[PDB]
Amino acid sequence: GSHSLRYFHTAVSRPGRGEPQYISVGYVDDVQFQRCDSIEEIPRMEPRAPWMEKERPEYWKELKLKVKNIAQSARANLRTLLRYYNQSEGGSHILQWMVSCEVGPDMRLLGAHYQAAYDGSDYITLNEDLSSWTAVDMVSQITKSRLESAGTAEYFRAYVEGECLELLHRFLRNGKEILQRADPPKAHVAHHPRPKGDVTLRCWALGFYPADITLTWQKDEEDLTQDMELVETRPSGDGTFQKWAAVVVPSGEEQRYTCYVHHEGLTEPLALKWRS
């Protein structure tokens, strides 16, 4: 339960030949729905999810205008920023911003986000009250001042309550089979003998959706989270994810260890031990 529509945008000031100078991707929860570009000022749009085939042409028509517009502003801001930080003219700079809105399990508006970064670092962020901005230095304080005088927050608020809400609800209703699901993880403990006589126990969790999961190993009732090796959750590539957590244990003492998997697709957490 609880869903979110999110866009990640990136503008680059010295792309290269055949590389976009603007690119944005949209997601509804952990599923990507589209990709937008601008290579040499020519917008491109591509669907990446099933429910997009049920999107009437009035959608792609307005988007193309939005991409051209945003691509145009982005290149302007890059130049302005470069001038404001007094940076030299021949560098490769990135401006990134995320825009999102989420609704609760009862489908009401929970909140919305707007944040920018210049060159990999926060730059400006819109507050939870959706009216004040938090800046991080004198340059962004200049920006904060301008967006505050101009009244810019009210315009994002309009967008949130308008297009964002509209697209979320629609994508959820038309993408139902995909987004309003929760596939449970396939878990198992693997056993690998190290050479000093000891063994690695790897607790696997495969094929789950959403990506949010918790694998924790325990000795008796001792939480081994600081001492266990963990990989960040990774995409299997078919819309599902995987992850594994390993601990090293002396041979013979294997039954002492338990793996716990917590996923919203599971009815109750699984508690696996090595079998055999």
Binding site: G26, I70, N77, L81, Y114, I124, I142, T152
Partner: peptide, 9 residues
Amino acid sequence: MYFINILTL
């Protein structure tokens, strides 16, 4: 799909 004019619009 929104962009606020960071600087000088």
